[PDB]
Design a binder for these strands. Structure first.
Length: 76
RNA sequence: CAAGCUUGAGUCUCGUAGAGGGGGGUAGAAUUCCAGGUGUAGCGGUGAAAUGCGUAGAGAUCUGGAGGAAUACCGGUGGCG
């Protein structure tokens, strides 16, 4: 569920996937953070144990809200 | 029982203070909501949290509008009944 995002990420390099599924390739964490920032989105570590770790560009708050919404609705 | 008397009690005149009552108008602050601009990943809450809300862009900021409810300061062993 919970993913670490943005500056919480410690990986030197990550494989980057953008908000639409475009495979941006291997990028330094710094460049990945720049791309996320220019798009006003978050850099989310979706696959911490992949080699190299996989990050997805997305709105973390919107993603998390929808996930919690889904869980709650299906149980009431 | 009858006549009175004016101090009790009323009536008259002119003023005073008051959130006293009833009706009708109207005002500026705020909350919530609606519509937009800027902005971007959090907001919110607690002892700590989680539920909740936010990338269908929240919260924060600026703008316009709707609506209801109550009237900060004045304000006080102040006032009225």
């Amino acid at each position: 569920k919970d993913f670490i995002i943005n500056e919480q990420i410690r990986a030197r390099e990550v494989r980057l996937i953008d908000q639409n599924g475009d495979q941006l390739g291997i990028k330094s964490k710094q460049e990945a953070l720049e791309i996320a920032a220019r798009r006003n989105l978050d850099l989310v570590l979706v696959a911490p144990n992949a080699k190299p770790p996989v990050c997805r560009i997305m709105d973390y708050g919107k993603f998390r809200f929808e996930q919690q919404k889904k869980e709650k609705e299906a149980r009431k």
